[PDB]
Amino acid sequence: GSCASCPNNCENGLCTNSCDFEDLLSNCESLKTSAGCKHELLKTKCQATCLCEDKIH
Prior knowledge:
Layout: H1 28-34, H2 42-45, H3 47-50
Protein name: Cysteine-rich secretory protein 2
Family: Belongs to the CRISP family.
Function: May regulate some ion channels' activity and thereby regulate calcium fluxes during sperm capacitation.
C-alpha cells in the first residue's frame, strides 16, 4: 500500500525524504553551530545538514 516504502514519512501518501545527502556524523547539527553548514568540513560529512535539511522550504 502507500507509505509502504516510507511508513515513517507520508505527508499525503508520498515519502518526505527527497534529500540526496546524508549526515555522515550525527553531530552535524552540533557542528553547524560550532562551525557552519557553509563550512567546507560540513560540506563533506554534513552535506545533508548544509545542502539539505530533511526538509526543503
